[PDB]
Amino acid sequence: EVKNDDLELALKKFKRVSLEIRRLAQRHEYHLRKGMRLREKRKIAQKKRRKFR
Amino acid sequence: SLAKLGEMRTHVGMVKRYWNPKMGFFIEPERKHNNDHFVLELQRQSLQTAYNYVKEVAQNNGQILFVGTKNDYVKKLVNNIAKRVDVAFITQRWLGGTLTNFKTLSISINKLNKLVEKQAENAADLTKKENLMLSREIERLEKFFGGVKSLKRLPNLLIVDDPVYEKNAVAEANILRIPVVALCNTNTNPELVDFIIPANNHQPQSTCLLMNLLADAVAEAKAMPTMFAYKPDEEIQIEI
Amino acid sequence: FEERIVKLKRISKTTKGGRNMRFSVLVVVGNRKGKIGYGIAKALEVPNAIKKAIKAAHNSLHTIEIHKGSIYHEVIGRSGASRVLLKPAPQGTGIIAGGAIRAIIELAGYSDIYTKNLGRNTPINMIHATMDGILKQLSPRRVAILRNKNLNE
Amino acid sequence: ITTTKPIKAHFDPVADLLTKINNARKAKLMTVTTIASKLKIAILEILVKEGYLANFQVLENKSKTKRIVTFNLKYTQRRIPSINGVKQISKPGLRIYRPFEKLPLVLNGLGIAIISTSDGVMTDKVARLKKIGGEILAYVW
Amino acid sequence: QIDKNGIIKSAQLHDKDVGSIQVQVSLLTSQIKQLTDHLLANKKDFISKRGLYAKVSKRKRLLKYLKHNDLEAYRNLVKTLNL
Amino acid sequence: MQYNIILLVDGSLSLEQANQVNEKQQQTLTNVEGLQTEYLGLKELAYPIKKQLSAHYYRWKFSGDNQSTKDFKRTANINKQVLRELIINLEREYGYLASINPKKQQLALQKRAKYDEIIARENNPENPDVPVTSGLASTQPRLSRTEKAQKPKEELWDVVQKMGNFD
Amino acid sequence: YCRFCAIGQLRIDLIDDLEALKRFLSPYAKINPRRITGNCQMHQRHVAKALKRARYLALVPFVKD
RNA sequence: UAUUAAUCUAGAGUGUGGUAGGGAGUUUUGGAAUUUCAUGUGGAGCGGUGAAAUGCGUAGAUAUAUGAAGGAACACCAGUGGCGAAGGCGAAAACUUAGGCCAUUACUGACGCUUAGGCUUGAAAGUGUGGGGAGCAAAUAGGAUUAGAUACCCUAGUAGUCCACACCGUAAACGAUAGAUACUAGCUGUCGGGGCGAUCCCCUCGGUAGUGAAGUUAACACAUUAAGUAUCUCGCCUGG
């Protein structure tokens, strides 16, 4: 994930990218299950269909 | 004439994809562009039935109400109804029970009138904070009783601008034995009103016409000049 | 307008300290002319709850037809899963029923009836089920007129 | 009356009749369709003769093999349907056969029973009079 | 590879009959052989094992009917896989 | 059985070795043929895929017997000159509808939509208009006619009037 | 904004409509969900398979731009 | 009620045209990333929770960057989901390919469905054999809050987890909803088919879901896939 815009604007655009990577890769330090993975996929689908629509 | 095709300039149209099976009778099914269109002939026949029934009720000399609970359009319509024929009417909040429960509301409106009479008789006999509280209470009673304060007796017949918009009115009318006249919409249900008329409130061409003709029925019943119900196309009161 | 009571339910709602006792009552109103009306209400004490239930019941009065004044067709009434079965008793076998069932049957103007209450013994749903069972019966005239065949046989 | 589409066969035809009629009165429908048997056409005709349901049309496509029937439900001027809920008596696995001595009268002389005794569909009164008993098919009152 | 049309035009009884009980049982037997090769190649195919049982016992039902109703209708059908 | 093959050659090497890869893969397909020899030039590979960071893209679309796939994949993976050997068949699911000429309007209007940046178009890439004629061709026909008729029945008109009169 | 029912090709494979497949692909080498693409989802799931193939084919990086 | 004969299919299903899906199993490949190995550097920390601690570490640990071996599963794509006999399936691909979907007029022509008997599968754990322990982790070892504590947590680590023959043939096997047949709105929203159009906003019929009419239920709540409507069948609950 490269971000090259300016001296500081590159990091301003990289803020969202870093947030996305942190939220995506945070699930490799605790217990999880594949059925629960599909469960949480459905849950986030419902969340984005109700709030983000 | 009486809900003639011309009088409804363009009253067809409603929200996208909301229609009951037995509302497929008075309102044709979903359009290619997702619009429930209100038919004209069935509107005319239903309004003819409602017109004759309200005419014979007025011959019976019962008490009626023209409901203007809606913000501006129907409120102005019922104001015109009242200025054309003198009749008790409700424009503010139709309370959740004012016909099945009206005893403690009769005493409430009597307290209101008595307090106004006393204030007319009174001229600053107390501290002004108590007068401020007096006006406070008067306006508190007005903001709930502002619609229902002109009738001292239960109505023998009532009209409705929308069956879902007047749930309290239709509920209190079904508690009693008075028939209901309403302007049903395709999102409403037709198993609730004693006189189902496919008149749109979103499209004003139907509701304005029906309010004017309901006024005119009791106007001609009272032997006074009649404004509408004989014109091929009445006043175009299209709301913006 | 007898406004006869059938059962009072001892109830209490928990609140911030103590328990508010607002025991409910259920009454049946009739005027010896076949009029029937059931009403359930509640208040702090007995008289207020009784008066409220009386008003609620008398607000709607219903009369049922009498022909061969038993439940001339076997029928079981359920209101909230309470079995109350009424079956035709001949006019010379004598009335055999339960107390609440006897009250409901005799208030309607009927005669000897073959009744049977089942399962639960909570009188509120007993009265509701008995009312539903007795009031859902159709008259011979009803089918005689609704059907094209005028003869009722 | 051309169907323009053939209906799908049920597990049993009398239960198809019951389901179609009950869902028609439940969905506020006035026309019902069912298979066409000599027994079933006879039962529909005898139901019509006793004022329970309206006109019936037997529809044959190219042979008696593919035959159905579409019948309207009776609706009195009071908007009350004459069909108070049809029921079957000749139930698959619950085939109840009553002799002439065991022919009953429906809810104490209010309803009509359909009895095919020995030659065809017969109403309750004629079945008692004909001193012949047999199968009881359906109950409509 | 399902043998969709090939097995159907073979055992026809009449001029135009693409659903003949004979051709239904022929299709069922062809699919049973194919799904048996499937099962021996794939021992852990549970869905296909269930489908194979369904097909084979429906073939048994169809054979029972074809013997029950008309002799000639299964006089030309004696090729059912056995032994 | 429909078949596609995508070949990726070893690294950023010259197109001559890409043609050598073509020749090598020619003999791998024993008798099932129909392939078309096309090249997509040199395209980079973003992440290290097997050992390389770029390749030359080739596609061969044959059809026929489906047994000449496993051997192709193994001989192309064993050979160092190929890094991707991919073969596509029915497990890839797509459309080949017999009635595709009614979609030519879509063919023209999406290319118009992809060229919506010109002023000469009024239709947006997502524009609600409902232009379909709603053809069905979805009725199972049957020829039948009535045989009996008895007891005509009628009812009142469907406008409820409570008590019918209040005079 | 569909790109395969709109184009009417109806034929999805590896390399014949790659730009149409990438129309649902963000520059971040990630595909937008159904709630963002809003298409018939036959073509969107075909995009899913085709671009996961592309990641396997190293057309677009796994975790990179 | 059951049988007899055949044409009609209209459910059993079948044909032609199309057809979505991570179905399943078997097979093929790949490395983003970690560990070992290779190059190094570097100074005093790393490891981590509730505060920390066990533990690794001056011999070079943690870190720092890629590369061969290794094996796990394959960020987004992922759907008010699809498929799937519930069970379960998400890098990609192939073989068999089950079943989902309509246009299904056409087609043997009642053949049918449940189904105790029986057959199969039913996650995963664990475990007999052959592997890796790279990574994880039951058991295990330590520190730690509980009055201890085996229980929260953290660190490591054997079988095992992962693969194949597989076994236990058990579940929170959940839609806590047995199947098959015929029918029942609307609407909310995901999907398939045919049809015809730019795609959504088009129709029809279905798969998986919901609010909700009639209908049903003890209410919550089912509601087109019923717990409905009726049928058919099997099994079970007649108190803990």
Swiss-Prot record, chain A:
Gene Ontology cellular component list: ribonucleoprotein complex; ribosome
Query: To which protein family does this belong?
Result: Belongs to the bacterial ribosomal protein bS21 family.
Please name the GO terms that the record assigns under molecular function.
structural constituent of ribosome
Alphabetized, the UniProt keywords read: Ribonucleoprotein, Ribosomal protein
Species of provenance: Mycoplasma pneumoniae (strain ATCC 29342 / M129 / Subtype 1)
HAMAP family associated with the record: Ribosomal_bS21
For whether the record's keyword set contains tRNA-binding, the answer is no
Q: Does the keyword Ribosomal protein apply?
A: yes
Name listed for the protein in its UniProt record: Small ribosomal subunit protein bS21
> What gene does the UniProt entry assign to this protein?
rpsU
Q: A biological process (GO) annotation for this entry?
A: translation
From Swiss-Prot, chain B:
- UniProt keyword Ribosomal protein present: yes
User: Can the keyword Ribonucleoprotein be found in this entry's annotation?
Assistant: yes
Coiled coil location: none
GO biological process terms on file? translation
| Cellular-component GO terms for this entry | cytosolic small ribosomal subunit
Top-level taxonomic group: Bacteria
Alphabetic keyword roster: Ribonucleoprotein, Ribosomal protein
Q: Which GO terms describe its molecular function?
A: structural constituent of ribosome
Which family does the record assign?
Belongs to the universal ribosomal protein uS2 family.
What's the protein here called? Small ribosomal subunit protein uS2
- The encoding gene: rpsB
Which residues of the parent protein does this chain contain?
A: 19 to 258 of 294
From Swiss-Prot, chain C:
Q: Which residues form the S5 DRBM domain?
A: 1-64
Q: Which UniProt keywords apply?
A: Ribonucleoprotein, Ribosomal protein, RNA-binding, rRNA-binding
For this record, the Gene Ontology CC terms, alphabetical, are: small ribosomal subunit
Key word Cell membrane present in the record? no
- The yes or no answer to whether the keyword rRNA-binding is present is yes
User: In Gene Ontology terms, what is one molecular function of this protein?
Assistant: rRNA binding
Which GO terms fall under biological process for this protein? translation
> Which domain of life does the UniProt lineage start with?
Bacteria
According to its record, what is known about the domains?
Answer: The N-terminal domain interacts with the head of the 30S subunit; the C-terminal domain interacts with the body and contacts protein S4. The interaction surface between S4 and S5 is involved in control of translational fidelity.
Kindly state the subunit structure of this protein: Part of the 30S ribosomal subunit. Contacts proteins S4 and S8.
> What does the function comment of this entry state?
With S4 and S12 plays an important role in translational accuracy.
Q: Which family does it belong to?
A: Belongs to the universal ribosomal protein uS5 family.
Q: What is this protein called?
A: Small ribosomal subunit protein uS5
Species name for this entry? Answer: Mycoplasma pneumoniae (strain ATCC 29342 / M129 / Subtype 1)
Organismal lineage: Bacteria, Bacillati, Mycoplasmatota, Mycoplasmoidales, Mycoplasmoidaceae
Shown portion of the whole protein? Answer: 66 to 218 of 219
From Swiss-Prot, chain D:
Q: Which UniProt keywords apply?
A: Ribonucleoprotein, Ribosomal protein, RNA-binding, rRNA-binding
Which protein, by its recorded name, is this?
Answer: Small ribosomal subunit protein uS8
Q: Which family does it belong to?
A: Belongs to the universal ribosomal protein uS8 family.
Query: What domain of life does the UniProt record list for this protein's source?
Result: Bacteria
**Organism (species):** Mycoplasma pneumoniae (strain ATCC 29342 / M129 / Subtype 1) (Mycoplasmoides pneumoniae)
**Cited HAMAP family:** Ribosomal_uS8_B
Q: Which GO terms describe its biological process?
A: translation
Q: Does the keyword Zinc-finger apply?
A: no
The record's section on NCBIfam families has: PRK00136.1
Give the GO molecular function terms: rRNA binding; structural constituent of ribosome
The record's subunit annotation is:
Part of the 30S ribosomal subunit. Contacts proteins S5 and S12.
